[PDB]
Design an enzyme around this catalytic site. Structure first.
Site, PDB file in Angstrom:
ATOM      1  N   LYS A  77       0.693  -1.051  -0.035  1.00 28.23           N
ATOM      2  CA  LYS A  77       0.068  -0.046   0.010  1.00 28.23           C
ATOM      3  C   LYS A  77       0.911   1.456   0.068  1.00 28.23           C
ATOM      4  O   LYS A  77       0.452   2.376  -0.692  1.00 28.23           O
ATOM      5  CB  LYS A  77      -0.976  -0.071   1.019  1.00 28.23           C
ATOM      6  CG  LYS A  77      -2.144   0.926   0.885  1.00 28.23           C
ATOM      7  CD  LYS A  77      -3.377   0.346   1.739  1.00 28.23           C
ATOM      8  CE  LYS A  77      -3.147   1.052   3.153  1.00 28.23           C
ATOM      9  NZ  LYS A  77      -3.581   2.668   3.025  1.00 28.23           N
ATOM     10  N   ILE A 121      -9.066  10.674   5.922  1.00 26.48           N
ATOM     11  CA  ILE A 121      -8.003  11.134   7.001  1.00 26.48           C
ATOM     12  C   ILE A 121      -7.075   9.938   6.838  1.00 26.48           C
ATOM     13  O   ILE A 121      -5.599  10.520   6.570  1.00 26.48           O
ATOM     14  CB  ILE A 121      -8.698  10.964   8.488  1.00 26.48           C
ATOM     15  CG1 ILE A 121      -9.771  12.249   8.204  1.00 26.48           C
ATOM     16  CG2 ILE A 121      -7.623  11.522   9.569  1.00 26.48           C
ATOM     17  CD1 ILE A 121     -10.719  12.271   9.616  1.00 26.48           C
ATOM     18  N   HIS A 122      -7.145   8.715   6.806  1.00 26.92           N
ATOM     19  CA  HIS A 122      -6.443   7.815   6.716  1.00 26.92           C
ATOM     20  C   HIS A 122      -5.424   8.044   5.362  1.00 26.92           C
ATOM     21  O   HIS A 122      -4.310   7.762   5.637  1.00 26.92           O
ATOM     22  CB  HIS A 122      -7.154   6.332   6.567  1.00 26.92           C
ATOM     23  CG  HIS A 122      -6.014   5.271   6.154  1.00 26.92           C
ATOM     24  ND1 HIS A 122      -5.287   4.429   7.143  1.00 26.92           N
ATOM     25  CD2 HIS A 122      -5.685   4.710   4.870  1.00 26.92           C
ATOM     26  CE1 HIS A 122      -4.564   3.693   6.834  1.00 26.92           C
ATOM     27  NE2 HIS A 122      -4.848   3.567   5.284  1.00 26.92           N
ATOM     28  N   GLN A 123      -6.051   8.433   4.413  1.00 27.73           N
ATOM     29  CA  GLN A 123      -4.995   8.648   3.181  1.00 27.73           C
ATOM     30  C   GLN A 123      -4.271   9.661   3.299  1.00 27.73           C
ATOM     31  O   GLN A 123      -3.111   9.638   2.631  1.00 27.73           O
ATOM     32  CB  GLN A 123      -6.092   8.829   1.729  1.00 27.73           C
ATOM     33  CG  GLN A 123      -6.796   7.825   1.321  1.00 27.73           C
ATOM     34  CD  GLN A 123      -6.066   6.644   0.639  1.00 27.73           C
ATOM     35  OE1 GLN A 123      -5.782   5.494   1.359  1.00 27.73           O
ATOM     36  NE2 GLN A 123      -5.424   7.033  -0.385  1.00 27.73           N
TER      37      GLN A 123
END
Ligand SMILES: [Cl-]
Ligand SMILES: [Cl-]
Ligand SMILES: [Cl-]
Lengths: 243, 243, 243
Positions: free
Chosen positions: A72, A225-227
């Site tokens: 990822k 937000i994770h991105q």
């Protein structure tokens, strides 16, 4: 044999057992596909009333693998989301977490209607251990089910908590010795299965309504937000050091 | 003498005692009428500041009778709803549940601002034991007051829980020996009554606002689902077997 | 020396220590100004990741003084609101309440992301002890963080609760001996500070969102009711008798 197997326990209670030993019940392609298949089988048998979801040996679910996370960082893969799989099931589910549950694997169990934890096993929302923010509507589900304070500490620290430590902390779920976890779940399932299936389905839909209404936006907001937080320079090295 | 009696405890604390021995404090016509009357008397006396609601002997409230439920299967009667009676009272209420509370009878106490349970007595949201879904905004009130997990298990199983079992489970209300329940409530009432009545009324209105906003829709939704699940072929026989 | 001091604990953890001995950490002008200053310093240092807020000796925060309340009965002053000060801080805050916390002083700690209580110290939302309703979004914050039932009893009675009593009651925060409170907070802070600052800030914003959305209306509604209940004939005498 397939890594996810469905067995009948009687009176409409069934067990779905995850046993991908090679990934320690990670979100491997075979686990995802076998969960889809077994939940399809459940949806098609009108006689089934309660699902017990469980692991094998020392593991309930390991969630996304570190190898996957490294892929990822290179933009090789996108975020796995097994929530729809669990939340689409119309009959009550008891997650018999007889083994460890990490990250998405802890959320997988917490998506269930009832949850049983092992005293000896370890549980973590480990996103922040790697240095990035959660996915999967972690904050929504943990605050609802573990309470806002356990949820806060587990999410911020990303640490591993033994079942015993969570029980001492007042977690609102049963925590029993590992060798008793599945039995406890089975006993609860048999009590639940005494009701007519129609009533179980109707009740679950009613009880699940408020969280289901909030779920899509929760997933979306956490993803956004994770991105940002996942794609920061130091994250690849942090993941490397957790192998 | 009337089956529901109001007595003065001093400093503005009053006690409303249900004693319909013939129905074991069921939702009998005399209990409903006597509760209406005593709460009318309370509303009219400006000196009253705290109401303690309690039962007699081994019973707090038995809710709707099995005889009543059998009549309902024939479409003889409609669903009893005592919520407005309790929720309309503008001063704080402590439910001293010194005895058992079943179904609507458990909800009757849980509509109060404070609740005290007996260690030895039994408590149940028994709707699903008969095989049908709740009425009375059961899910709203139980999730708010007992916590989502106890609420889940009690509603799905319909089983009888002793006070002691609920305490061991971490219920967020005091659970004391039967002979101490009313005394505990009276002591709490006297503490509360130290405040000016104006402030008690204003505070209760403020604190009750969020649940009161949600209550009508909760009642309506539970009623709608109840009508479907109650009117299924096998329910009459299930009720018969609980006598 | 200034009554509020900022010190560095390492790894981005900092401590803000309130020591206005003359007011026992009341909402004195010097406490308010020193909190503003120290939180300004925090906002400006990008290396800081966790704030530990604490008191001195036997006191965390005494909130508004009785002298202040007497001035208010004459319309001499308006309601102090330190919430914006705390809620504006973008990094996680741990309130190490090693001493007593009264009224606004208890709320000051509860505005933090994590809270640690002393076993030996006393805690109160004492508004109703004086005979009037809360300010500061007391009901919002207490129900969210202590649970609806503790919140209910503490707000209605206005009484002093020792940490030990709150722990026995199942409060969802750690309660440890006074000499261990700050150490416990520091240890938790160091765990939290292992994460990248960017991720801490993003997570806190996400987790705080729902309460932050509700906060302004909560403050306004409590203020409105407070203005009515505070300005009643008997209140000045009630305050007099608490000196
Ligand atoms: Cl079966
Ligand atoms: Cl009286
Ligand atoms: Cl530092």
């Amino acid at each position: 044999n397939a890594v996810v197997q469905l067995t009948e326990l009687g009176n409409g209670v069934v067990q779905i057992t995850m046993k991908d030993e090679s990934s320690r019940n990670g979100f491997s392609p075979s686990i995802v596909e076998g969960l889809r298949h077994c939940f399809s089988v459940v949806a098609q048998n009108q006689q089934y009333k309660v699902v017990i979801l469980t692991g094998y040996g020392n593991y309930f679910s390991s969630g996304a693998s570190k190898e996957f996370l490294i892929r990822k960082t290179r933009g090789e893969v996108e975020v796995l989301d097994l929530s729809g799989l669990i939340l689409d099931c119309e009959i009550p589910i008891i997650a018999a977490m007889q083994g460890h549950s990490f990250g998405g694997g802890l959320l997988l169990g917490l998506y269930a209607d009832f949850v049983v934890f092992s005293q000896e096993s370890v549980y973590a929302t480990n996103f922040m251990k790697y240095g990035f923010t959660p996915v999967g509507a972690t904050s929504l589900i943990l605050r609802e089910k573990l309470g806002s304070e356990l949820a806060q500490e587990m999410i911020y620290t990303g640490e591993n908590y033994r079942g015993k430590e969570l029980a001492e902390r007042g977690i609102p779920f049963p925590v029993v010795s590992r060798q008793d976890v599945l039995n406890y779940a089975q006993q609860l399932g048999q009590k639940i299965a005494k009701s007519p299936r129609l009533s179980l389905v109707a009740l679950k839909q009613h009880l699940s309504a408020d969280i289901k209404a909030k779920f899509p936006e929760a997933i979306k907001k956490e993803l956004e937000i994770h991105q940002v937080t996942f794609n920061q320079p130091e994250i690849a090295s942090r993941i490397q050091q957790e192998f």
